[PDB]
Design a protein around this ligand. Structure first.
Ligand SMILES: CNc1ncnc2ccccc12
Length: 164
């Protein structure tokens, strides 16, 4: 069903995460963490304090798909265990030092071909597949994009709801 999902998405903020590689998205699915550059680190830290849920929607570059989406459960933190990201060319581990804890809501893929009818008012009404890392997605677009994903029966939204 979709009722607990819709409850989680009600009045959420949505952000596009564009991973350069698959390795870090698999790590993020395994460990429930994400790290971004400080400009997006600041944006997400602000959004986490402002909304009942902040949803990150992942897509790895060149894949033609989204790989799932997750909810921020914390602000970024520095000083923990060095998460072994595959660091992109031009990105240092000090830049990715901020670590967000995330709860996955769906780890299933969605091909871009299935989101062609959805455009983002905060990105000039471009198809929602188009955007740089950190691009905020408007409420209705983001909600409808999340509802397009195949349900992930492995995930129980009860624990997620217990953090809102
Ligand atoms: C886990 N950190 C990352 N991994 C892969 N690509 C990225 C692109 C922009 C910012 C952060 C990235």
């Amino acid at each position: 069903g979709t009722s607990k999902l819709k409850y989680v998405l009600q009045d959420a903020r949505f952000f596009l995460i564009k991973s350069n590689n698959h390795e870090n998205v698999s790590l993020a699915k395994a460990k429930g963490v994400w790290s971004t550059l400080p400009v997006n680190e600041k944006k997400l830290n602000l959004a986490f304090r402002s909304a009942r849920s902040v949803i990150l929607i992942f897509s790895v570059r060149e894949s033609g798909k989204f790989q799932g989406f997750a909810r921020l459960s914390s602000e970024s933190h520095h000083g923990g265990s060095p998460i072994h990201w595959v660091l992109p060319a031009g990105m240092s581990a000090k830049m990715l030092g901020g670590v967000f804890k995330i709860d996955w809501i769906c780890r299933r893929e969605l091909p871009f071909t299935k989101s062609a009818h959805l455009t983002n008012p905060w990105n000039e009404h471009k198809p929602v597949k188009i955007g740089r890392d950190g691009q905020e997605i408007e409420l209705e677009c983001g909600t409808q994009l999340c509802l397009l994903f195949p349900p992930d029966e492995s995930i129980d939204l009860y624990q997620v709801i217990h953090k809102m």
